[PDB]
Structure 1
């Protein structure tokens, strides 16, 4: 960083051409073939209506990129010059001034190339030829004798498995097929003296409250022929002030040098996850000094913490949980997918907003699921500074893969590159070999699809990749981080004997058609996947569809559904709990309410059942395009009802009323580090007009210990509420400390929404609108159920939404958007259940 090197970004002056046309046009780099075409209206909007079919032709053509740049005489006399490609998608021939520098074959590898002997004083010409990844792999497929069973690869021929390229680019059961190419990450040229730091690893040797012991491991590449005396320095600082400083004398030899400097931090300030404290980061800087001058420098942000994954046999089967700084931590978060069909269109602002969405929803963990990418350095920096643990899959999902020597050598290159790239992040907690490949080999009926000899080949192939190569590479390069070969590693949703062993993917809800209530009984040791779909709200549907298409199974809505079951299954689930509205608009509103309430029920069952269950990661956080899917946040950044419900279900203190077998239990759930003493629970039945039925019920002298779920109240329904009252009232619950200050509250309904006697009502609101802001006060004299405050403004944020407005209780809501202007009244439309029939 702060050294005598000069860096030139090659981010301007690029042109592209469809190969064999000789027509050139301006391009943006980093970027994609598809975005470059869109920018010159050579493709329609890939996301609108039926346009998916209309853009498939791009994957059959080859594509060429070129730029030129100036090098001075002074630059050419530096000791060394490197050209760095952080990403090429995928089969790319790189030519500089007549030299073939590189034949790239892995989207997930960065390439560092020496170019000083090939550079010229004046103009320099860089050309890149991108072979179609389809045409490049058709002969490979022809030679194979069988088709890999990759059902998410939306083509007769399943060519995805032969290419180290983002699996979802070929299609997915929530995804558009956009098999793109190009310079997907930045290109840089570094001019320097003596040497570069190829790698800086801060290895934590031990950590106690009294001391942290580190080993600073440096790989230094020396480009000059002489022996060079040098001083290696490491500076450890906190908030700009030096904590400790160490140095070592060396003489650097030509080529690779290994340097190790120990360092200690007495009374260390620990990194803590979101909800448990501050995600404190130290600045570790390494310098190579030759005389006056600092020839190379590299820094990392470093969090001092311990992370142990506990996976041991016990009385219930096999445990699966995270211990952070010595304390077992119930996991709360979601599975993350790519934010766009076109990865470089995802901006810094969009990454910062997604981490804001996770932190505000009380999350402490994200799984980077194995059909996407190894994410960019910014994703992992934001995880570090927001206290969110990362579960990292390798990029293999839902099919067996090849295991021939050439293919395994490509995989080894990506594994070593991305382990060294990511191993200094505080957030990084564990590596996972793949998503569901063992499950697929055991249970998806491959015995019947292939010969005995091919099935046998697939099974031996699984072990070579997932039980040998990947675990050895983690042992060698990240030896204190946990690795598991697959998620889920043994449990099957169809086999209850197996649920006590490791993590679960519960396909029972959605694919199995089970009701949401099944989640109270079908418990795992750790839920790493479960979910339910929704249509996104109307302002997103209008981005891909017209009013002619507003039907659950129109041609266009079916084109924005990629699951087998499809859109009618949502109708099937809705009927069990809600009256089905006639309006499409009203159906969509109720679908959002449905997904939120059903999933929140599962999240609550998982926390309630700790310590048998030690975490829950729902499917899925986010969307790559305008689509019907399992997401809690649509493509445009709009929170669905699920996201507000995840935030509530993940609250550090939670009152959880649960009704089973005509009785009510109330559990108090805490992920706090401190115990709470002398607490009062208070409850009160209130009818849909605001009249108390009976007296208040009070439970005193309650203890809520750190990191526990405990029952503190049970009562039969017969003898308390009339069946008529269960249709016409709700329970208010509140938790207060010794002094009577409120620390939590909850609302309970005794019957399904469709069996409620909801009074017709209207929600009135006053509005005060300034620049960037609108403050609403809401009022109804009768209960309004599950209200949705709807506005046309894309990405508008709400203090709250998708909540019950209680009878004669005024409610303040704040709406923020940089697009909100004083004197330009924001349109507001307030929906509620009773209005839909």
Structure 2
């Protein structure tokens, strides 16, 4: 780094309910809710009916205080800067009798010059958080109408007035915890001469032969004199200098703009997950005043990302081109990982990225009702090769567009754009989630006067068609912006499906069968989804045995969608026998969500290039709840996660059966063509015996980045209705020499129509520290087996798979909490067991 010193204001904090004069220890970064919980002043907010029991917190004001020492020597540094990375939300900040700041935007980092107010010895920092509810009640009263924000779970929809995480007020998968606090870190920096307020590595061009960069620095000089300095940029890879440039300047008091070109010959490109290595250069800029007074570095990925959104014969395309190659996007919508943001640990972020990488994903949407994520989130996306689609934090309701609200939004857009624009992973900006769809199709025209509706339509344009796009054009001029997701397509209107991106909620809200995903195709799927109850160990975190019915108060409850638990039963009944026990119903509901959802994922990939991506709703959960998530709050992979992994495999054999006939497609996202390939298939009954003979299709090629049909056959004359109920299709793809590159299994009937034999999955266990190895055997098919353990967060090599007749299967379960001796409890479930 440089000669500055940083003091972390992360200890010795206390908090108070205002007007009580009672102080208790606090943890910062943190939240009022966690501080109370930690003194047993709230029940577990996630347990039972306890949501209503914690609401009172949002009606109180909350105070925070800390003290720190400053030395005579520190006070003699040229400048001293206090930085709040995050204040939630209406925060009056006092230091040593000075009001430093009236903060009003959760999404903004505040940098404050404090030398002239600090004192040798003890220094006293106090922060007063006004209730976001009481702060905005007068605002609402003056408004004359209630914004149609159905996700804001209160009679008055105050959320829209505050630049605060929309989901904190509730959501259709979320608990209401309208929290407050110092949500990101506080630092004091003691420094000489200047600081680097911004360092932007702007890529000018990239070819195989050369990368041209422009290093753009904003330097804030704090002393009264003009100061000769040399600006230096070092570009290194893996600890070795690649290129180095320097510039003489004389820094003036105040802001200085410094621009140094640099080039990297024969650059090593950053590639997305599945296409190579996510190579990151180290770019370091230093200010040297004959000592390095200031330094700032960024990890930089050298790549092009173009979003192609052009009129074509099919409507309007919507796809991503990476390093000149169209890349079919495979991923999911990401939501905040906790009701209480500072509770989400480094480990939890690293684990989530591991989950995305291991599921073969190359894209995550940071959906617009959460937060602009922390720097760590983006750093991990950079180093895992995952593209980031970044919504601005507007979701599902129109918002105000008065001048002072828009000045607030402008502050947050400039802050986060400059914060995020150096990440290799950042791929596009999206003005909002679902707001134009909402304005057009959600029945507002009957909920408000014409003049108010006109006001809302004009407000939409001010923010999402003017302010936000101009801010991106200014500060991130080479990145794509689109005003809303979905921008035109609506799920109820087939005429619009060829136009940009879709949120197909035909499945779920429109009750369409999963098979509808085969015919109802988008140019890009930015949302589609299906709910499930999480597994029992998670339920046991939030419900009691008495509450084990699909619509008791508690489940209902932990159901926040406008049609809920009943829909899960409705869909289940189409394809499965509904089990009589709750635990069995939970198991099949996981299998259900997995099988139906992967059917869509497959349909989207199969239909490339018409469709160029699929991002399911949703990756993750913020609390224990029944949701569209593929990984529950405790990090347990649902069926859907293993199925998404399978559906996103770089090479996939996709058998698709419709109108009593089978097609097999070979789908590849590899960058190289596969030549001289052999598809081989056979029908095997549930006892292990082959029906007929092996079918072989030789001489197959799988070109890079294509989906292609290689086999078709009518069922009639091949299999009888009886066989379709009592066998499966095994499929394998192999190269010239017989090496297997891909396999699949196909069933010819719905699971409820299968004549599944009673059967026992036996296993042998070899348990050590951290590790559990199981070998599973069944003489007969066991359908969609779930290997269930009580260890929260335990990870599995595979799970939610069919255990084929006779064919042994190795599964490894890992967890730091696995001890040698202490045999891991294991419960193996499968479909036939769920009914008599």
TM-score calculated relative to the size of structure 1: 1.00
Which is further off, 716-725 or 350-359?
716-725
SS in 2 for 1:232: strand
Counterpart Cα distance in 2 of 1:97 and 1:717: 82
**Which one of the candidate residues 518, 537, 540 is aligned to 2:538?**
540
1:755 Cα deviation after fit = 0.5
1:559 Cα deviation after fit = 1.2
1:564 Cα deviation after fit = 1.3
1:210 Cα deviation after fit = 0.5
1:251 maps onto 2:285 in alignment:
no
Counterpart Cα distance in 2 of 1:471 and 1:101: 32
**Which one of the candidate residues 689, 696, 705 is aligned to 1:698?**
696
SS in 1 for 2:568: helix
1:384 Cα deviation after fit = 0.1
1:230 Cα deviation after fit = 0.8
SS in 1 for 2:701: strand
Counterpart Cα distance in 2 of 1:667 and 1:472: 44
1:756 maps onto 2:719 in alignment:
no
1:785 Cα deviation after fit = 0.3
Counterpart Cα distance in 1 of 2:219 and 2:294: 9
1:501 Cα deviation after fit = 0.5
Counterpart Cα distance in 2 of 1:415 and 1:350: 27
Counterpart Cα distance in 1 of 2:620 and 2:342: 17
1:722 Cα deviation after fit = 1.3
SS in 2 for 1:835: helix
SS in 1 for 2:411: helix
Counterpart Cα distance in 1 of 2:54 and 2:267: 55
1:12 Cα deviation after fit = 0.4
- 1:759-812 Cα shifts (integer Å, max 9, x gaps): 101111010000111100000101000000000000000000000000000100
- 1:17-68 Cα shifts (integer Å, max 9, x gaps): 1001101100000000000000000100001110000101000000000010
1:524 Cα deviation after fit = 0.5
TM-score calculated relative to the size of structure 2: 1.00
Counterpart Cα distance in 2 of 1:363 and 1:203: 27
SS in 1 for 2:627: coil
SS in 2 for 1:130: strand
**Which one of the candidate residues 488, 502, 505 is aligned to 1:504?**
502
1:124 Cα deviation after fit = 0.4
Counterpart Cα distance in 1 of 2:312 and 2:404: 42
1:447 Cα deviation after fit = 1.0
Partner of 1:283: 282
Partner of 1:665: 663
Counterpart Cα distance in 1 of 2:785 and 2:444: 47
Counterpart Cα distance in 2 of 1:288 and 1:549: 63
1:686 Cα deviation after fit = 0.4
SS in 2 for 1:151: coil
Counterpart Cα distance in 2 of 1:827 and 1:222: 63
Partner of 2:675: 677
- 1:605-658 Cα shifts (integer Å, max 9, x gaps): 000000000000000000000000000000000000000000000000000000
- 1:278-334 Cα shifts (integer Å, max 9, x gaps): 00000000011111x100000000000000000011111101000000000000000
SS in 2 for 1:645: helix
- 1:683-718 Cα shifts (integer Å, max 9, x gaps): 000000111111111011111100000101101101
Mind listing any 5+ residue stretches in structure 2 that lack a counterpart? none
1:675 Cα deviation after fit = 0.4
Counterpart Cα distance in 2 of 1:723 and 1:257: 78
- 1:342-392 Cα shifts (integer Å, max 9, x gaps): 000000000000000000000000000000000000000000000000000
1:115 Cα deviation after fit = 0.5
Counterpart Cα distance in 1 of 2:709 and 2:392: 40
Partner of 1:336: 334
Partner of 2:39: 40
Counterpart Cα distance in 1 of 2:643 and 2:556: 27
Counterpart Cα distance in 2 of 1:248 and 1:691: 76
Counterpart Cα distance in 2 of 1:256 and 1:571: 63
Counterpart Cα distance in 1 of 2:629 and 2:144: 38
Counterpart Cα distance in 1 of 2:487 and 2:319: 14
Counterpart Cα distance in 2 of 1:707 and 1:145: 54
Counterpart Cα distance in 1 of 2:742 and 2:602: 15
Counterpart Cα distance in 2 of 1:714 and 1:184: 57
**Which one of the candidate residues 352, 355, 362 is aligned to 2:353?**
355
**Which one of the candidate residues 619, 622, 629 is aligned to 2:620?**
622
Partner of 2:576: 578
1:677 Cα deviation after fit = 0.6
SS in 2 for 1:604: helix
Counterpart Cα distance in 2 of 1:626 and 1:493: 29
1:145-544 alignment to 2 at 5 Å? Answer: 145-291=144-290, 293-544=291-542
Task: Count matched residues.
Answer: 835
Counterpart Cα distance in 2 of 1:48 and 1:462: 39
Counterpart Cα distance in 2 of 1:32 and 1:775: 41
Counterpart Cα distance in 1 of 2:54 and 2:720: 61
1:758-837 alignment to 2 at 5 Å? Answer: 758-837=756-835
Counterpart Cα distance in 1 of 2:494 and 2:67: 63
Counterpart Cα distance in 1 of 2:566 and 2:467: 44
- 1:576-602 Cα shifts (integer Å, max 9, x gaps): 000011010000000000000000000
SS in 2 for 1:827: coil
Counterpart Cα distance in 1 of 2:686 and 2:444: 56
Counterpart Cα distance in 2 of 1:664 and 1:253: 74
Counterpart Cα distance in 1 of 2:674 and 2:402: 58
SS in 1 for 2:541: coil
Counterpart Cα distance in 1 of 2:181 and 2:202: 35
Counterpart Cα distance in 2 of 1:695 and 1:165: 63
Counterpart Cα distance in 1 of 2:798 and 2:717: 36
- 1:385-406 Cα shifts (integer Å, max 9, x gaps): 0000000000000000000010
Counterpart Cα distance in 1 of 2:550 and 2:369: 28
Counterpart Cα distance in 1 of 2:531 and 2:249: 60
Counterpart Cα distance in 1 of 2:275 and 2:283: 24
1:248 Cα deviation after fit = 0.8
Counterpart Cα distance in 1 of 2:764 and 2:265: 57
Counterpart Cα distance in 2 of 1:445 and 1:553: 28
1:500 Cα deviation after fit = 0.6
Counterpart Cα distance in 2 of 1:723 and 1:438: 48
Counterpart Cα distance in 1 of 2:625 and 2:364: 22
- 1:716-760 Cα shifts (integer Å, max 9, x gaps): 101011111111110100001011100000000100000101110
Counterpart Cα distance in 1 of 2:221 and 2:656: 66
Counterpart Cα distance in 2 of 1:760 and 1:344: 49
SS in 1 for 2:556: helix
1:77 Cα deviation after fit = 0.5
Counterpart Cα distance in 1 of 2:296 and 2:552: 56
1:424 Cα deviation after fit = 0.3
1:566 Cα deviation after fit = 1.1
Counterpart Cα distance in 2 of 1:781 and 1:509: 37
Counterpart Cα distance in 2 of 1:498 and 1:154: 32
1:111 Cα deviation after fit = 0.5
Counterpart Cα distance in 2 of 1:192 and 1:56: 44
1:126 maps onto 2:121 in alignment:
no
Counterpart Cα distance in 2 of 1:546 and 1:206: 60
SS in 2 for 1:378: helix
Counterpart Cα distance in 2 of 1:564 and 1:205: 48
- 1:798-836 Cα shifts (integer Å, max 9, x gaps): 000000000000100000000000000000000000000
Counterpart Cα distance in 1 of 2:608 and 2:787: 35
Mind listing any 5+ residue stretches in structure 1 that lack a counterpart? none
Partner of 1:22: 21
Counterpart Cα distance in 2 of 1:251 and 1:713: 71
SS in 1 for 2:589: helix
Counterpart Cα distance in 1 of 2:252 and 2:692: 86
